[PDB]
Design a protein around this ligand. Structure first.
Ligand SMILES: *[C@@H]1O[C@H](CO)[C@@H](O[C@@H]2O[C@H](CO)[C@@H](O)[C@H](O)[C@H]2NC(C)=O)[C@H](O)[C@H]1NC(C)=O
Ligand SMILES: *[C@@H]1O[C@H](CO)[C@@H](O)[C@H](O)[C@H]1NC(C)=O
Ligand SMILES: *[C@@H]1O[C@H](CO)[C@@H](O)[C@H](O)[C@H]1NC(C)=O
Ligand SMILES: *[C@@H]1O[C@H](CO)[C@@H](O)[C@H](O)[C@H]1NC(C)=O
Ligand SMILES: *[C@@H]1O[C@H](CO)[C@@H](O)[C@H](O)[C@H]1NC(C)=O
Ligand SMILES: *[C@@H]1O[C@H](CO)[C@@H](O)[C@H](O)[C@H]1NC(C)=O
Ligand SMILES: *[C@@H]1O[C@H](CO)[C@@H](O)[C@H](O)[C@H]1NC(C)=O
Lengths: 360, 256, 50
C-alpha cells in the first residue's frame, strides 16, 4: 500500500508510525474553594420587601448551581436567555442576586414582557433579560397566625418602573387634581400596602420568596466561572492531561526537580513542557510524552517469500521472535550469533537476511 | 479631612542591575532565556525621593507609564502602600493598596482621593487617604508583602486587565542602598482589575503626637520606570535567576 | 404557537438529521421516569409569534 505496487523488492521500508494510544483522561483542574455565598442569599433568615428589593452583586468567586438543584421546595426554576443545564459551564462577568417576597399569584409576573402590580410598580425585567428566576414557598418562615405585617408592596405609582429600577419613596399618591399635602384621605392614598400573610391562605396567596439571578458580561475579564471537576490522578500511563488549562498527552512520572513555590509549569531548553506542579497536591511530575515509533517493514522480494519482520524504531520491546536492538524493537526475526555480510540494513551494526528472516 | 503635610525632595541615582523579576511562572533550569517584557533597564536613571513631614502641597502624583519599580531600605511600617488610577476622584475607578501589621488590603472602588494622602495611626484610618468610596467593584485581603538592612523591591504592572505585583526582600550588608549583584523579584499577585491606570502615588504612615498634630518623619524610596526591553536571563540548576544581560544597554551585551 | 423547537437534547444532531421524538429529557441528577414535574421539562417549546 505504501509503495503503490503489488511486488515489493527486497529491503526495509518505513511504512507506518506506531503510537501509544491515550488510555485515560486526567483533568486536574485548580483546587475548587471559596465558592460564591449563595447560602447567604437563598437561605437567609430575613428577606426584603418587593418595593425595597435587596440586590447583592457577585464577583470573583466560583459560581455553583448544585446547591440550587439540591433544594426541593422550588416552585419555579424558569430560566431566560441561557439554559438551566449549561449554567455550570458557560460563565459570566457579574451575577446580580435580587431577593424579595411576593404572593404566589404574582410569581408569573416575574418574567420579561409581563404586566401587573409587581411588574409595573415593584420589579421590572427587561425584554432581553439573560438570567434565571427562582421562587419557593415560605409558609414556615413568613406566615404568622396574627398576620405578618412586615412585608410591603407598592400599589400606586405615577408611571411604570424601568427595568432593574427600585422605588423606596413614601410620597402620598396624588390621584386627582387637589394637592395631598401629606395627609391621606379621599383621592390621596399611601402607596405601600402590607402583605398580611397568614398560614390559612390559599395557595395563590401564600408568601413566596423570589431570587432573580441576572448575569452580565462586560469588557472586563469574566471572573465568575463554575467549578471544573478534578478527577483522580493516574501516574505511569499515557493519559490526556489537563492541568490548569494546560493540555496535552503524556505519561506523568515522579520528578526529582525541586520547583520554587511560585512556579507552576516547567520547560525544556527547546521550550517544550517537561514538568508540571499538580494544583491539588503540591508535587512535581515529569511529563514525558507517550512512546512513538517509525514502523519499518523488513521483507525479501515477493518473488522469493512473503515473510516479513517489523522494526519499531526507537521503541523499547516492553512498550509494544522479539529482539531488542539499539535501532528499536525487531519482531519477527530470530537473532543468530553468526556473522554474515549485510543484506537488509537494520542499524547499529544489525542487519537482516532471508535464509525464515534472521537478524545478525 | 484632606490635609497637605508631606514635602518631597528628589535626586538621581543609578539602578545598577536591580529590578529583574520572573517574567512568568515557568520553571527553567540551566538555560539562557531571552524574554521581551517591561523591565527596568540596567544602569538607568532612578529617582530617589526623600519625603519629610515636619511638626503647602509639595507631594505631587507621579506618572505610572508602563509600570513602576519601587525600592526602599526603610522598615515595613513607614511606607504602607500605594494609590493607582487616572483622575484619583469619584468619576473614575481607582486602586488602593494598604498594608498593616497583620495583612494587606487591595481594593478597587471609586475613591475620592486626597491631594496628600497618608495613613494616620491612632488603629488606622483611611480618612486622610480618601474622602469617599462608592460603587466599589473589587476587594482582596491577603497576607502582607511588607514584612521584616532589608531592601524591599516591588514591580507594578497593569497589563490587559490584570494588575501584576512582583516583590522581593533582600538582606543587604551595610553599604550602598542599591547594591550590586542580582536578586530576582518573585511573582506575588495577579489581580483581575480591568481599570485604566496612568498615575500613582506612594502612601506613608504618620503617627499622632499626643502632646504639629503628627510626629515628624522621613522616608527614602527609589522609583524607576519599566520600559519594553529584551533581557537575557540565566537560570541555574535550581531554577533561580542568578544573572541577566540587558540586550540594548551596550554592544557587548547586545552580542551576548 | 404551531411552530416548536427542541430546547433540550442529550447530544447534538448530525447534519441533515431530523428529531421528532417527544420523549422527556433528564436535566438533573434525579431521574424523571417519563413524568413531568419539578426540574423535569418537555424538550419542545412553542414560539410566541405575534
Ligand atoms: C489590619 O487590617 C485588617 C483588614 O481590614 C483588619 O482586620 C479587620 O478588622 C475589622 C475590625 O473592624 C474586622 O471587622 C474585619 O473582619 C477584619 N478583617 C480581616 C480580614 O481580618 C485588622 O484589624 C487591621 N489591624 C490593625 C492593627 O489595624
Ligand atoms: C440551604 O440549607 C440546606 C439545608 O440542608 C442546604 O442543603 C443547602 O445547601 C442550603 N443552600 C441552598 C442554596 O439551598
Ligand atoms: C487542595 O485540596 C485538598 C483536597 O483534600 C485539600 O486537602 C487541600 O487543603 C487543598 N489545598 C491545597 C493548597 O493543597
Ligand atoms: C538623571 O536625570 C537628571 C535630570 O532628570 C539629569 O540631570 C542626570 O544627568 C541624569 N543622570 C544621568 C546619569 O544621566
Ligand atoms: C455610581 O454611584 C452613583 C451614586 O453613588 C450612582 O448614581 C451611579 O449609578 C453609580 N454607577 C455605577 C456604575 O455603579
Ligand atoms: C486612560 O486615561 C488616560 C488619561 O485620562 C487617557 O488618555 C487614555 O486614553 C485612557 N485609556 C483608555 C484605554 O481609556
Ligand atoms: C541547588 O540545590 C542544591 C540541593 O537543593 C544545593 O545543594 C545547591 O547549593 C543549590 N544551588 C546551586 C547553585 O547548585
Amino acid at each position: 500500500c505504501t509503495l503503490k505496487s503489488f511486488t515489493v523488492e527486497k529491503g526495509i521500508y518505513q511504512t507506518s508510525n506506531f503510537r501509544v494510544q491515550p488510555t485515560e483522561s486526567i483533568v486536574r483542574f485548580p483546587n475548587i474553594t471559596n465558592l460564591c455565598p449563595f447560602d447567604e442569599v437563598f437561605n437567609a433568615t430575613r428577606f426584603a420587601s418587593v418595593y425595597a428589593w435587596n440586590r447583592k452583586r457577585i464577583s470573583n468567586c466560583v459560581a455553583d448551581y448544585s446547591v440550587l438543584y439540591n433544594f426541593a421546595p422550588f416552585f419555579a426554576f424558569k430560566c431566560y436567555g441561557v439554559s438551566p443545564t449549561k449554567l455550570n459551564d458557560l460563565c459570566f462577568t457579574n451575577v446580580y442576586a435580587d431577593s424579595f417576597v411576593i404572593r404566589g399569584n404574582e410569581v408569573s409576573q416575574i418574567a420579561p414582557g409581563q404586566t401587573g402590580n409587581i411588574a409595573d410598580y415593584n420589579y421590572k425585567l427587561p425584554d432581553d433579560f439573560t438570567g434565571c428566576v427562582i421562587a419557593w414557598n415560605s409558609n414556615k418562615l413568613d406566615s404568622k397566625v396574627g398576620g405578618n405585617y412586615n412585608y410591603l408592596y407598592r400599589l400606586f405609582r405615577k408611571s411604570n418602573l424601568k427595568p432593574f429600577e427600585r422605588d423606596i419613596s413614601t410620597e402620598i399618591y396624588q390621584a386627582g387634581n387637589k394637592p395631598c399635602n401629606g395627609v391621606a384621605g379621599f383621592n390621596c392614598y399611601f402607596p405601600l400596602r402590607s402583605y398580611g400573610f397568614r398560614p390559612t391562605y390559599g395557595v395563590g396567596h401564600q408568601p413566596y420568596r423570589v431570587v432573580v439571578l441576572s448575569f452580565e458580561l462586560l469588557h472586563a475579564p469574566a471572573t465568575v466561572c463554575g467549578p471544573k471537576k478534578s478527577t483522580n490522578l493516574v501516574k505511569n500511563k499515557c493519559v490526556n492531561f489537563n492541568f490548569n488549562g494546560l493540555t496535552g498527552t503524556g505519561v506523568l512520572t515522579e520528578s526529582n526537580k525541586k520547583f520554587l513555590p511560585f512556579q507552576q509549569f516547567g520547560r525544556d531548553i527547546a521550550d517544550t513542557t517537561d514538568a508540571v506542579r499538580d494544583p491539588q497536591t503540591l508535587e512535581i511530575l515529569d511529563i514525558t510524552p507517550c512512546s512513538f515509533g517509525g514502523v519499518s517493514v523488513i521483507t525479501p522480494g515477493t518473488n522469493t517469500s512473503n515473510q516479513v519482520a517489523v522494526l519499531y524504531q526507537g521503541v523499547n520491546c516492553t512498550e509494544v521472535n522479539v529482539f531488542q536492538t539499539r535501532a528499536g524493537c525487531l519482531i519477527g526475526a530470530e537473532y543468530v550469533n553468526n556473522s554474515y555480510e549485510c543484506d537488509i540494513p537494520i542499524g547499529a551494526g544489525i542487519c537482516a537476511s532471508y535464509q525464515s528472516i534472521i537478524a545478525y | 479631612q484632606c490635609v497637605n503635610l508631606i514635602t518631597r525632595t528628589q535626586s538621581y541615582t543609578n539602578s545598577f542591575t536591580r529590578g529583574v523579576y520572573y517574567p512568568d511562572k515557568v520553571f527553567r533550569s540551566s538555560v539562557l532565556h531571552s524574554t521581551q517584557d517591561l523591565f527596568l533597564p540596567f544602569f538607568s536613571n532612578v529617582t530617589w525621593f526623600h519625603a519629610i513631614h515636619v511638626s503647602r502641597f509639595d507631594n505631587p502624583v507621579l506618572p505610572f507609564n508602563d509600570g513602576v519599580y519601587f525600592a526602599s531600605t526603610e522598615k515595613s511600617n513607614i511606607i504602607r502602600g500605594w494609590i493607582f488610577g487616572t483622575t484619583l476622584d469619584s468619576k473614575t475607578q481607582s486602586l488602593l493598596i494598604v498594608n498593616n501589621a497583620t495583612n494587606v488590603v487591595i481594593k478597587v472602588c471609586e475613591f475620592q482621593f486626597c491631594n496628600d494622602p497618608f495613613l494616620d495611626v491612632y488603629m488606622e484610618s483611611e480618612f486622610r487617604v480618601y474622602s469617599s468610596a462608592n460603587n466599589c467593584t473589587f476587594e482582596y485581603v491577603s497576607q502582607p508583602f511588607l514584612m521584616d538592612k532589608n531592601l524591599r523591591e516591588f514591580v507594578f504592572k497593569n497589563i490587559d486587565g490584570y494588575f501584576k505585583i512582583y516583590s522581593k526582600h533582600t538582606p543587604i550588608n551595610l553599604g550602598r542602598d542599591l547594591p550590586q549583584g542580582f536578586s530576582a523579584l518573585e511573582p506575588l499577585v495577579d489581580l483581575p482589575i480591568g481599570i485604566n491606570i496612568t498615575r500613582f502615588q506612594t502612601l506613608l504612615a504618620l503617627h499622632r503626637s499626643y502632646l504639629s498634630g503628627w510626629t515628624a518623619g522621613a522616608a527614602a524610596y527609589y522609583v524607576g520606570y519599566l520600559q519594553p526591553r529584551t533581557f537575557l536571563l540565566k537560570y541555574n540548576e535550581n531554577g533561580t535567576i542568578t544573572d541577566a544581560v540587558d540586550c540594548a544597554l551596550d554592544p557587548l551585551s547586545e552580542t551576548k
